[PDB]
Coordinates of C-alpha atoms and ligand atoms in Angstrom, one line a residue:
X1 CA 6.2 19.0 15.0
X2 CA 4.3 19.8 12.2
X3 CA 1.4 17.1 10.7
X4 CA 2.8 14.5 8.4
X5 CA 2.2 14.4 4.3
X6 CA 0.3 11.1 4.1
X7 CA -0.1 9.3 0.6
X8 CA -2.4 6.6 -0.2
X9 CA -4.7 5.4 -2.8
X10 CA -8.3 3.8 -2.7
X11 CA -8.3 0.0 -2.1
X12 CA -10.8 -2.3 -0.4
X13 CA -10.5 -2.7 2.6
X14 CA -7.4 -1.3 3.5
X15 CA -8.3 2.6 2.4
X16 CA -11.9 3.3 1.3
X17 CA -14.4 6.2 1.4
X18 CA -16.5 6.0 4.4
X19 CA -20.3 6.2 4.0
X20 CA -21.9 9.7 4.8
X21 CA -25.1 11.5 3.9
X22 CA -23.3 14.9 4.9
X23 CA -20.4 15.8 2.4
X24 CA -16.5 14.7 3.8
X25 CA -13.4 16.4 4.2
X26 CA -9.8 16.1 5.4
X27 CA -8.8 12.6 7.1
X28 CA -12.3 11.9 8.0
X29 CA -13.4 11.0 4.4
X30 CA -11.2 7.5 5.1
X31 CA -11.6 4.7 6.8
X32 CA -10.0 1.0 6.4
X33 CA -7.8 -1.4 7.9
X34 CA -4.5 1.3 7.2
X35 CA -6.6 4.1 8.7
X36 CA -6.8 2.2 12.0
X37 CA -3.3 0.9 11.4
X38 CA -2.3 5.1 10.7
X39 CA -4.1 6.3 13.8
X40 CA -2.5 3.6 16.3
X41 CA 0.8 4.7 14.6
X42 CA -0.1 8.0 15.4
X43 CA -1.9 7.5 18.7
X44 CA 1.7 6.0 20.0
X45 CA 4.0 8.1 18.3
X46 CA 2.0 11.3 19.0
X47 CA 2.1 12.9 15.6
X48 CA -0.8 14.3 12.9
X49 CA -1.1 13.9 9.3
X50 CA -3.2 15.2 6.5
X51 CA -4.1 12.3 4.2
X52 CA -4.1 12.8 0.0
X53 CA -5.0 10.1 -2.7
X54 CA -1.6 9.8 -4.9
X55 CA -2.7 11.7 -8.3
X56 CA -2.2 9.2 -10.7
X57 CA -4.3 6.7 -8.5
X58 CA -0.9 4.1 -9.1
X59 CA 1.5 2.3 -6.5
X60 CA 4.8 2.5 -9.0
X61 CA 7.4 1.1 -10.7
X62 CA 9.9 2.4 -13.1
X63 CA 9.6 3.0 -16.9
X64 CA 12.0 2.9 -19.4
X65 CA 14.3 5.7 -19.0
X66 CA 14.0 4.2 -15.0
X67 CA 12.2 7.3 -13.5
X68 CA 9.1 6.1 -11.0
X69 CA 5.7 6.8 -10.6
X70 CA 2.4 6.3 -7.9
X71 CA 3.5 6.7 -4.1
X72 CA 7.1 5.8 -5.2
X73 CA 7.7 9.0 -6.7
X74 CA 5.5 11.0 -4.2
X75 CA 7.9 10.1 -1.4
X76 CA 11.0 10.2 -3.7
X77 CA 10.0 13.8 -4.6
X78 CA 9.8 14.3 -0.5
X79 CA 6.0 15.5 -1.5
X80 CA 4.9 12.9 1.3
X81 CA 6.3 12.0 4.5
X82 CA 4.5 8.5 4.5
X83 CA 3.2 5.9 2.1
X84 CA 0.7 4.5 4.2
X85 CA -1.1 1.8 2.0
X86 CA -1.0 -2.3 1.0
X87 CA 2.4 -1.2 -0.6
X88 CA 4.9 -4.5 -1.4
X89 CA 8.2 -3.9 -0.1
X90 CA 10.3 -5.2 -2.9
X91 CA 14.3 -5.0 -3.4
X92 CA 13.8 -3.3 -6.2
X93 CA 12.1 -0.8 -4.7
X94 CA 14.7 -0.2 -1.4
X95 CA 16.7 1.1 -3.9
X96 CA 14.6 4.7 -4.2
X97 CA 12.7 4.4 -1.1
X98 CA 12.7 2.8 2.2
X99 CA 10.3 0.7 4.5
X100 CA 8.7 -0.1 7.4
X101 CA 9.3 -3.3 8.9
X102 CA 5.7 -5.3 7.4
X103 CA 2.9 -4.8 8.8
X104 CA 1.2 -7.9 7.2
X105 CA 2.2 -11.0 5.0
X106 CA 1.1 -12.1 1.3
X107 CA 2.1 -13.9 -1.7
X108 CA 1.3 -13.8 -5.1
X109 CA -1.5 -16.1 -6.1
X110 CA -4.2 -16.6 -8.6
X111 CA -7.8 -15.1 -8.8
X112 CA -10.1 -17.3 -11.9
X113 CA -13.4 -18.1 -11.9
X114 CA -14.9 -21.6 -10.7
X115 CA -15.2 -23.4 -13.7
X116 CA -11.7 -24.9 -15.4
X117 CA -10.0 -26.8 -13.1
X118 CA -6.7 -25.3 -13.1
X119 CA -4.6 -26.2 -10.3
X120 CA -2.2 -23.7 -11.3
X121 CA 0.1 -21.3 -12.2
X122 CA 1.7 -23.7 -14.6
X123 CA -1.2 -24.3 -16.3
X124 CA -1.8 -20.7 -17.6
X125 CA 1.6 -20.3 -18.6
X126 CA 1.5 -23.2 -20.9
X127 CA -1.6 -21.4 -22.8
X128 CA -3.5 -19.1 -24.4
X129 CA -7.4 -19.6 -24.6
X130 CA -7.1 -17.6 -20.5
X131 CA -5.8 -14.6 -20.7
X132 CA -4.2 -14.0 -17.7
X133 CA -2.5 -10.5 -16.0
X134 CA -1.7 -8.0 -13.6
X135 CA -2.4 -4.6 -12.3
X136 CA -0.3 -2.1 -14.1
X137 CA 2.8 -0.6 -12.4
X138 CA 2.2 -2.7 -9.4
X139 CA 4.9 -5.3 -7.4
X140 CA 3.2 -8.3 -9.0
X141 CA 3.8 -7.4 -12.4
X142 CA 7.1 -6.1 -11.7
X143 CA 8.1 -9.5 -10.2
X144 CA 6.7 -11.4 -13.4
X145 CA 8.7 -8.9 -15.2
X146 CA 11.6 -9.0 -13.0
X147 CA 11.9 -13.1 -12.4
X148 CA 14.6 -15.8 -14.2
X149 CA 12.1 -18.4 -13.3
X150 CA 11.6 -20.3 -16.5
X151 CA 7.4 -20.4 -16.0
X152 CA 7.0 -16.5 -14.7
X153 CA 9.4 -15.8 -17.7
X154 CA 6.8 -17.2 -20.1
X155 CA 4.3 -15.6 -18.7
X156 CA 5.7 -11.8 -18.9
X157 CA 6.2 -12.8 -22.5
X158 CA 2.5 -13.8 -23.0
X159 CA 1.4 -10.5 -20.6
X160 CA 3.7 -7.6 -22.1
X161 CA 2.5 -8.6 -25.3
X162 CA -1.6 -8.9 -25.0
X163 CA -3.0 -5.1 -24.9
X164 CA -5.3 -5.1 -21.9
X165 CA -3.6 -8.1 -19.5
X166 CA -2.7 -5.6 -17.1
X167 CA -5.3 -3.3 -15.9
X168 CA -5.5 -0.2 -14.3
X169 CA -6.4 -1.1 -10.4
X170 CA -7.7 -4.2 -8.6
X171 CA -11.9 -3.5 -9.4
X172 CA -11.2 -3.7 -13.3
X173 CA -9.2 -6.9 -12.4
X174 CA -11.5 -8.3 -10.6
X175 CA -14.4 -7.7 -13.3
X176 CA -12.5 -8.7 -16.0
X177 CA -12.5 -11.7 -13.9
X178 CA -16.2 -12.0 -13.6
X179 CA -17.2 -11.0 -17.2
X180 CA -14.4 -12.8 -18.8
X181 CA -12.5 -15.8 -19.3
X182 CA -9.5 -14.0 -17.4
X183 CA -7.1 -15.0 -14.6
X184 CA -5.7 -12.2 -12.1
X185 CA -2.3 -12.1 -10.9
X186 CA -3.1 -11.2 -7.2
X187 CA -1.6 -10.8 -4.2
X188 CA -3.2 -13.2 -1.3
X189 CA -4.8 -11.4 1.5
X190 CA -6.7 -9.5 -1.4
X191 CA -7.7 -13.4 -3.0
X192 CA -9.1 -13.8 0.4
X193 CA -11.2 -11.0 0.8
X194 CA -12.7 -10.8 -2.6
X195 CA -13.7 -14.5 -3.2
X196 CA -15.6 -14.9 0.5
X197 CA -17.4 -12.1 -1.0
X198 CA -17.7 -13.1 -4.9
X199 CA -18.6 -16.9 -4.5
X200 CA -17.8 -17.9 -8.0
X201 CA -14.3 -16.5 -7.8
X202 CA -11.9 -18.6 -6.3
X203 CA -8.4 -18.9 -5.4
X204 CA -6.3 -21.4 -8.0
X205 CA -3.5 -23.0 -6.3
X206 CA -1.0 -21.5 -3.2
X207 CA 1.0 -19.0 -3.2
X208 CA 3.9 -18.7 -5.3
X209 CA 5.9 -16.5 -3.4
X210 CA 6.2 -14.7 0.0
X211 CA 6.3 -11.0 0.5
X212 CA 5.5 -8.0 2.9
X213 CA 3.2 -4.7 2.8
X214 CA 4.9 -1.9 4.9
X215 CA 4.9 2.0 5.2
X216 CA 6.9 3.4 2.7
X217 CA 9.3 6.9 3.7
X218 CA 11.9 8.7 1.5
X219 CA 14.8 7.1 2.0
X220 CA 16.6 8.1 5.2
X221 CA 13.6 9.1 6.6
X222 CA 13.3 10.5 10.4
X223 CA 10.2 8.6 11.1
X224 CA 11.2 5.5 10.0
X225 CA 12.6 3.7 12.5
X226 CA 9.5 5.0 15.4
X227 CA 7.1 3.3 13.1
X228 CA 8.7 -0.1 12.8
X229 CA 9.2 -0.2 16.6
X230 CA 5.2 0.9 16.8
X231 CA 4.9 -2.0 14.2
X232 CA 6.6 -4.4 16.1
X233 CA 4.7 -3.7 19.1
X234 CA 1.5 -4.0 17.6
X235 CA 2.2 -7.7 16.2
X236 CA 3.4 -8.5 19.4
X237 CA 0.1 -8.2 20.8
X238 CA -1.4 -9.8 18.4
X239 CA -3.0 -6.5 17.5
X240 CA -2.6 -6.5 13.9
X241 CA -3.8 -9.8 13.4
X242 CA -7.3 -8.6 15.3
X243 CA -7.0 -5.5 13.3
X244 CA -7.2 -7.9 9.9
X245 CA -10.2 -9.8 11.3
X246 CA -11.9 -6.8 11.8
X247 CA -12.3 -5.4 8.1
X248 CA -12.2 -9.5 6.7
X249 CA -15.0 -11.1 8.5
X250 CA -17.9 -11.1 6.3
X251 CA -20.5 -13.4 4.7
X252 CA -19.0 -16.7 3.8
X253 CA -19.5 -18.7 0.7
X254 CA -21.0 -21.9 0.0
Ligands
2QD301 C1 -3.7 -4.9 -2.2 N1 -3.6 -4.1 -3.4 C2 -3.7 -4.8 -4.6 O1 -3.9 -6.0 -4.8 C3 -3.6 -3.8 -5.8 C4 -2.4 -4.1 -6.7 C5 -1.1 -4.6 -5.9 C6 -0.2 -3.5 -5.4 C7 1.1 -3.9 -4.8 N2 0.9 -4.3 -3.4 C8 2.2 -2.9 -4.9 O2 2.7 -2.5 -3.8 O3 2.5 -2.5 -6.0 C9 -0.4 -5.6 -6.7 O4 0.3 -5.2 -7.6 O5 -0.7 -6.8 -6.5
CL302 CL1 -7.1 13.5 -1.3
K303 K1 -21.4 11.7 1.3
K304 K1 1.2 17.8 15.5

């Protein structure tokens, strides 16, 4: 009965702050491909929220000691009601939080400059002259972290041990990418946006494995279940796949 806790962190397109010559507040400051996917959810369901960027600016994943951080602790702490972000539902993950049925599908792929002809992942792993990584405490470097296959394995080793392969967020991936000779881990739909806008970025290979995003809740959360019906719904109209092309279409790329 009462407005929702909603957490989320900056990231283009699906969060972003909208362009104003007057000062922002509240929800109003957003806008992105989750804020129309939020306000649908709300629009059907017929509840309010107050939107705050998760402190640390991180998704999460566990440390040592295996306490969480980013949006994973926020809802694990029951200091949000909803995680409403590109946030990768992982196994690992179900096991301090739950999901939403997805609301869109990636994979993990590769974002390198135009220039080597790499083909792919393979080919990093198998090297060192590319430095290659991840953004920190997200589900792609958990799964390199995480995986018994032999190549990914090789390349947590190489990772882990090189100071700054995994970066803080997505825009110092992406420069690092652009300034240096660096490959970044990324997930797909993100490869897609950034190199039809950056035309000397491009994608290197397919996709190396097959994932979801959906809205994160504490675990046995009440509004759970009426968002992955509303979720459902949407697709089923083709709704979310409009919603996609909306904040996507841009300038292409010679
Ligand atoms: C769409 N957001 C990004 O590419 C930022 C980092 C992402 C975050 C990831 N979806 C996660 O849920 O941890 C990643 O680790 O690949
Ligand atoms: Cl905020
Ligand atoms: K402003
Ligand atoms: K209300």
């Amino acid at each position: 009965n009462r407005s929702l806790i909603v957490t989320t962190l900056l990231e283009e397109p699906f969060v972003m702050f909208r362009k104003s010559d007057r000062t922002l507040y509240g929800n109003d400051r957003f806008e992105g491909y989750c804020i129309d996917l939020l306000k649908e959810l709300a629009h059907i369901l017929g509840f309010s929220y107050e939107i705050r960027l998760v402190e640390d600016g991180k998704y999460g994943a566990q440390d040592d000691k295996g306490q969480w951080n980013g949006m994973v602790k926020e809802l694990i702490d029951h200091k949000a009601d909803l995680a409403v972000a590109p946030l990768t539902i992982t196994h690992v993950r179900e096991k301090a939080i739950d999901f939403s049925k997805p609301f869109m599908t990636l994979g993990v792929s590769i974002l390198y400059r135009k220039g080597t002809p790499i083909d792919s992942a393979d080919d990093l792993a198998k090297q060192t002259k590319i430095e290659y990584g991840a953004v920190k405490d997200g589900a792609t470097m958990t799964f390199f972290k995480k995986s018994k296959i032999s190549t990914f394995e090789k390349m947590w080793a190489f990772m882990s041990s090189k100071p700054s392969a995994l970066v803080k967020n997505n825009e110092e991936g992406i420069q690092r990418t652009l300034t240096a000779d660096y490959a970044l881990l990324m997930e797909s739909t993100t490869i897609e946006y950034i190199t039809q806008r950056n035309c000397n970025l491009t994608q290197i290979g397919g996709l190396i494995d097959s994932k979801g995003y959906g809205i994160g809740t504490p675990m046995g959360s009440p509004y759970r279940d009426k968002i992955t019906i509303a979720i459902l719904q949407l697709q089923e109209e083709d709704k979310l796949h409009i919603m996609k092309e909306k904040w996507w279409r841009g300038s292409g790329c010679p």
